[PDB]
Symmetry: D2
Subunit: 108 residues, 4 copies
DNA sequence: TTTTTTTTTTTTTTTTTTTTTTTT
DNA sequence: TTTTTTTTTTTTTTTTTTTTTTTT
């Protein structure tokens, strides 16, 4: 089933690069994407979407090398549903974006 | 900032159509989108993304009239970050998709 | 069948706007969007896709009041295959983008 | 500049595959994707966009082994503007889609 | 297949063409 | 601008064309 996400945002923190026990690079970036919209009066408003994106392999390292907090970037990937047991034994779930590619937007 | 979601999925429940105190129609649908992928062995796996989509106005009613539990549909919209205080006074947040359009996929 | 196009490009000429009998606007814009690829035997390349986009209603109006040659815009829409005949009966064809929306940066 | 195309279409002819000097595959497919619009003065209309897509590497191979005239597929890629000259020097142009990926239903 | 927590302009219709070195 | 909780096939390169009535 087709699952596609395309978002332009800026990092809310520096990218955190790690290696998984397996050897694969992994990274998670925090994105903030804002939208403007007119209120039924004439007021202009804003919604800010905060969301984490998962990176793996070469993509994770590319992100760690070229992006930093505040960086602007276009991310392309899929929507992800994470479901797991925390160390307390409590069921927990999460929605993240698993990114396939990044389009750097810092150069102006 | 560009914020786009395009997902094909099936409803996990019947669409729940309501009117907001303002008069606007609103509806929320539960989607399930599954992905298949090969495991580093040769096993084929699956991830299932469960996610809610918000509909408003004519879109909400269109959904309520033509879609039901198990229905296949293509949704196009944006990623949304919901943040609010529950009736207990506790901070709560959520990621949903706010849908702009629906492409029906039940007719075969 | 799903048909989506999302592209960022600069206008290659000014907006051309007319009005239909119904009264709704209809404009056409010329776009240019480039891609860099330092992928080749050795060095860096550049490809530019030139293409026209059809605009309708209030979108065509917004394009007409705010865009001009050189402007950068993001458009969403679908791919369109246009065909017709010459005054000499020679049938012609063409691909364009029919935009649903516009976002200017 | 961002350049995205996502389209579902049926193949209008069989897959045409060759191999480049490097050894990687390169195929071309003809697509047709239709849109319904019961929007007009009164009744229902239908438009079909015909367009060719360029495939490379293993994607071209998968297209060659599993697709044929009539097959339905979802392709992702970008819009491409191709140009060249006649043997008589007449310069030609063309729009195609260069696919990054393929998904067959 | 992979872990586990606030960044910094608007929203069916007709027509028939030549141009504004950050990774991948 | 808007509420508040498990559905049912694979993943820089060259070439130069005519076809497989669910809403919007």
């Amino acid at each position: 089933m087709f699952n596609k996400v395309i978002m332009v945002g800026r990092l809310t923190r520096n990218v955190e690069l790690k290696y998984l026990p397996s050897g694969s690079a992994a990274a998670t970036i925090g994105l903030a994407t804002s939208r403007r919209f007119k209120k039924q009066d004439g007021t202009l408003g804003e919604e800010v979407c905060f969301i984490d994106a998962r990176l793996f392999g070469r993509t994770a390292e590319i992100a760690n090398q070229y992006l930093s907090k505040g960086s602007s970037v276009l991310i392309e990937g899929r929507l992800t549903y994470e479901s797991w047991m925390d160390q307390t034994g409590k069921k927990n779930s999460r929605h993240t974006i698993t990114a396939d590619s990044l389009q750097f937007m810092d150069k102006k």
